[PDB]
Amino acid sequence: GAWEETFKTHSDSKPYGPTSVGLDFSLPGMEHVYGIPEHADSLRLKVTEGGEPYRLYNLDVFQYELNNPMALYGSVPVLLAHSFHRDLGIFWLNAAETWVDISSN
Amino acid sequence: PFTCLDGTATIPFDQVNDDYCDCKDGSDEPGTAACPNGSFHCTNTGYKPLYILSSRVNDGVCDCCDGTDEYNSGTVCENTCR
Amino acid sequence: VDRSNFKTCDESSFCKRQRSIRPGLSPYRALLDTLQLGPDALTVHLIHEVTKVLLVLELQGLQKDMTRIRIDELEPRRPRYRVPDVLVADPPTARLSVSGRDDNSVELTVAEGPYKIILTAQPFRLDLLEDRSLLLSVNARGLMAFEHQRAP
Amino acid sequence: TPQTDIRWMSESGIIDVFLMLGPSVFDVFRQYASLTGTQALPPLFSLGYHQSRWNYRDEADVLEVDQGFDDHNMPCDVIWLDIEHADGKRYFTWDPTRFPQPLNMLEHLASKRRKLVAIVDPHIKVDSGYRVHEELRNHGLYVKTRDGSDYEGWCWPGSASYPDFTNPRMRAWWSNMFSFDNYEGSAPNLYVWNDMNEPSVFNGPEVTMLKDAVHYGGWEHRDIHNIYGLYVHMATADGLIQRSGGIERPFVLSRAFFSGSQRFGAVWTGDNTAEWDHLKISIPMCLSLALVGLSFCGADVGGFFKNPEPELLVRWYQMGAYQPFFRAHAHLDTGRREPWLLASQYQDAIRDALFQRYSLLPFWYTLFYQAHKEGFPVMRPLWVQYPEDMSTFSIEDQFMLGDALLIHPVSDAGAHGVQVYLPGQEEVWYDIQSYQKHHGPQTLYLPVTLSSIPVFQRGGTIVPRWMRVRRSSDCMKDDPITLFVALSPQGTAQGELFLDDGHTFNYQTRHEFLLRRFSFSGSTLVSSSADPKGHLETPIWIERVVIMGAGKPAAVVLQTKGSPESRLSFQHDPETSVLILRKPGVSVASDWSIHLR
Ligand SMILES: NNNc1ccc(NCCOCCN[C@H]2C[C@](O)(CO)[C@@H](O)[C@H](O)[C@H]2O)c([N+](=O)[O-])c1
Numbered sequence A: 001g002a003w004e005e006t007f008k009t010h011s012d013s014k015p016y017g018p019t020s021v022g023l024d025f026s027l028p029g030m031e032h033v034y035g036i037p038e039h040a041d042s043l044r045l046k047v048t049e050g051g052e053p054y055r056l057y058n059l060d061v062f063q064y065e066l067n068n069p070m071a072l073y074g075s076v077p078v079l080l081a082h083s084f085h086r087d088l089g090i091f092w093l094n095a096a097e098t099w100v101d102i103s104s105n
Numbered sequence B: 001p002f003t004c005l006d007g008t009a010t011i012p013f014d015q016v017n018d019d020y021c022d023c024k025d026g027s028d029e030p031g032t033a034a035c036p037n038g039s040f041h042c043t044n045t046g047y048k049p050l051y052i053l054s055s056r057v058n059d060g061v062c063d064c065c066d067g068t069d070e071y072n073s074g075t076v077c078e079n080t081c082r
Numbered sequence C: 001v002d003r004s005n006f007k008t009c010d011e012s013s014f015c016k017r018q019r020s021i022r023p024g025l026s027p028y029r030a031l032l033d034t035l036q037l038g039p040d041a042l043t044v045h046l047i048h049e050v051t052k053v054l055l056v057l058e059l060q061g062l063q064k065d066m067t068r069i070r071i072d073e074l075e076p077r078r079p080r081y082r083v084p085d086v087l088v089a090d091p092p093t094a095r096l097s098v099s100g101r102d103d104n105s106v107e108l109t110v111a112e113g114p115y116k117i118i119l120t121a122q123p124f125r126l127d128l129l130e131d132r133s134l135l136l137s138v139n140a141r142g143l144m145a146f147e148h149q150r151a152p
Numbered sequence D: 001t002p003q004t005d006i007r008w009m010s011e012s013g014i015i016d017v018f019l020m021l022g023p024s025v026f027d028v029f030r031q032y033a034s035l036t037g038t039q040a041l042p043p044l045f046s047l048g049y050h051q052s053r054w055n056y057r058d059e060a061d062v063l064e065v066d067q068g069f070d071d072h073n074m075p076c077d078v079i080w081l082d083i084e085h086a087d088g089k090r091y092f093t094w095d096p097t098r099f100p101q102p103l104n105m106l107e108h109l110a111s112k113r114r115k116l117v118a119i120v121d122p123h124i125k126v127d128s129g130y131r132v133h134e135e136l137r138n139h140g141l142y143v144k145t146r147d148g149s150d151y152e153g154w155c156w157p158g159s160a161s162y163p164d165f166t167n168p169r170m171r172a173w174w175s176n177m178f179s180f181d182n183y184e185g186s187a188p189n190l191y192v193w194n195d196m197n198e199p200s201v202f203n204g205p206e207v208t209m210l211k212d213a214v215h216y217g218g219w220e221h222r223d224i225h226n227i228y229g230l231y232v233h234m235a236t237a238d239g240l241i242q243r244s245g246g247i248e249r250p251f252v253l254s255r256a257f258f259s260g261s262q263r264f265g266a267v268w269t270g271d272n273t274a275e276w277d278h279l280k281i282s283i284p285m286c287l288s289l290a291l292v293g294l295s296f297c298g299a300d301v302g303g304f305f306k307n308p309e310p311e312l313l314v315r316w317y318q319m320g321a322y323q324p325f326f327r328a329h330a331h332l333d334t335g336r337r338e339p340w341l342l343a344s345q346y347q348d349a350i351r352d353a354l355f356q357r358y359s360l361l362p363f364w365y366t367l368f369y370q371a372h373k374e375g376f377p378v379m380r381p382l383w384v385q386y387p388e389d390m391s392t393f394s395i396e397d398q399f400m401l402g403d404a405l406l407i408h409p410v411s412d413a414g415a416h417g418v419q420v421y422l423p424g425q426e427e428v429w430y431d432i433q434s435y436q437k438h439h440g441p442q443t444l445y446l447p448v449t450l451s452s453i454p455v456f457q458r459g460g461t462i463v464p465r466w467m468r469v470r471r472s473s474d475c476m477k478d479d480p481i482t483l484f485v486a487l488s489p490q491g492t493a494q495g496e497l498f499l500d501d502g503h504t505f506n507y508q509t510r511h512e513f514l515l516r517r518f519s520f521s522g523s524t525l526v527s528s529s530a531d532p533k534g535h536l537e538t539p540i541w542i543e544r545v546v547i548m549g550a551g552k553p554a555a556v557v558l559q560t561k562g563s564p565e566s567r568l569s570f571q572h573d574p575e576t577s578v579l580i581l582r583k584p585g586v587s588v589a590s591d592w593s594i595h596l597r
């Protein structure tokens, strides 16, 4: 699936092949993160370790369900981290399909 | 002086139609929009009279056919009682 | 509840590739010999240790206590997309200064402080501090992945 | 030791990330706002109540709905026209049988001082008789496939093509299409709803456009996907501005959005369901949107899918009345649920919710002016206002409006009470219904009935209201203000009030507006200018002051620049410590002070 790729019955000719980009960020002192809408999920974002990452890809999901990280209609790639001591934000300015993993330690 | 129709107070006559609601039943402001439970009487000369909510006095909408509910709103209402 | 209509991460081939990369020693490293402090930015070459792919890190301190990190290919076969019309202005920059250096590290000061950026050379890493408090790290878990444009 | 790690994985483009260092969350708001802009200031009418459904039948149905609100004394600013108003989902058209005279309908609504919203989707029916399709085809403004042909997918009108909104020439075309000469039957009180703009493609992968479709400049659809909807929203809003000659502020609702969409209007959470858990989730969904700059957020009141039971509809109106975008909307096969079709006890609680919302419009307007100027969210999680109270870091059945109002709507069937967390060390909170004061921090058990909306005003704040609720906000926008002063334990309070003409850019191009500061300390209420550049001709005056937490004074004195010193009559309730100052009568543009002797 690295180049030409099919999903169900639809074919992506992917003429440029794999071009994805990724990067991680560590937030010492932070236990609570928020943002990256739109998801039918809690205000405080959940860890994605045992499941799916949060998906940012504007999609029309018929009769969408609650408490899951499926991508809904809008995507704002902005994450806020809050603690007693400080507030931080990350703004990932990318317009392509984006997945976001969150892990606590 | 003037006393409310429900006896909740008694006020000088300069507090009748003074654009502030002083009676619980709204009876001190029959000509303004100041009371939430008041009524404005459309005389509609020559035709059927009508009562409207005080909140529709000078709201810019023609509620009476004679247009007398809009006298200081910037909306000029024509007489349509015909 | 039939969600087979929509891809999981595993069914997305770029998500499956990226997520298979797990926390560890990053193969990227900054070439401090290529370091250049420009008017608006610091630029330095990065390299993938195995594939020898060359990237360009463009680091910027910004007014209002912000940092912007941009990474692109040094010699791309074709231009990569940069999101237009979302930013309302070209963000006003603040001057970076080298305020510390060793063989594997370059410390950068944003204007006159208190914000600093530590660029580690090998492995590539970014740390952001206010004075001596570590605020945030970049690529600390070694998950940076940049698939360069191959022959179409 | 505690630490959170975040990993971003994107299909293409460069790495481009902004690190926003605070240190406070309001520093983060300002930082992000300086990058992507702030919430567009909504025209006042769009902060009122919107009545919508899929679909109102014809012009007669629209006018009956309009008359229904007045006959049942319920306020409403906008009635919405979904896709069945067009000719077979050819957008910018009107069904020739059911909407044959749109100008007359719009004129009838204008005479009631109400607006209309029409849906315009970005998919264009492939139809050689459809002038929109012919022009976009002839000018090559459609998204293309790799072989150079125009992309064709499926949507509401069947086979449809997708304009390339990433092309600036396409967006200018779209914007010009909203001129009153091009969009025949449109009028100044007609606004726009952009839907399906992800773009939704029924026969496409994941119900959207193929990754390898080609846009302006040769970029693939995989490169641009998440800003496609934003470009639709932007081009539409520019079109509503241009059609007025650059004078009128737009109102556009959009379903798809991106960073920066706050500059172009409102969004809503799409097709929710008439269920209690969907009611609950509207708070965290709109709160997560507020945190990232999208303050003009809401969810379909009553749920889009299925039929809500009357109790659920009541609670949804009460919830929606305290959320920024306030629209009831419903699926084609649902029963009609205009609020006067319910039994009287449910009608009465819904009307009460509508009155509270309309009374609070001056407050809502000022919060949106602050969002517009500073980038601060209107709707806020409790932890934004109490960043050191760790027990608030996850709260999502409660929210704040600005710093002044704490809201805990009932979101459970048959509830006998709610548990309200009132935060803050040395903080007091006033139940705005009973005026009972409560000290924080505590979790209060508050009994509720069907008509209860748990709302508390924070000590130290001043909230402006229009207590004269009329049929729409245009009818109210010259009315006098009542000020609600909630005294802190130190006997102090402050608040702001923004005013303008309610719908133009004159506040910005001509500095025609008022920004007033109200402040209480010692025993004196003072009004001063919070921005001297703003001047406004307005008949608005101060008709009443309600002070919570005050003792009985011996006399009340008002001083106004240009006027002799005056005495005010007052009423005091010793049980609730509520003081009501009668008819100060001072212009809202005037400096003045009231002293409690
Ligand atoms: N042409 N193909 N036929 C066909 C007929 C029916 C359906 N059922 C989908 C029902 O979901 C509606 C999605 N809701 C959208 C749109 C609005 O409903 C009307 O504009 C608006 O009210 C909503 O607010 C907005 O969110 C489908 N199909 O593919 O699902 C295909």
Ligand SMILES: [Ca+2]
Pocket: B015, B016, B017, B018, B019, B020, B021, B022, B023, B028, B029
């Ligand atoms: Ca009176």
Ligand SMILES: [Ca+2]
Pocket: B056, B057, B058, B059, B060, B061, B062, B063, B064, B069, B070
């Ligand atoms: Ca009237």
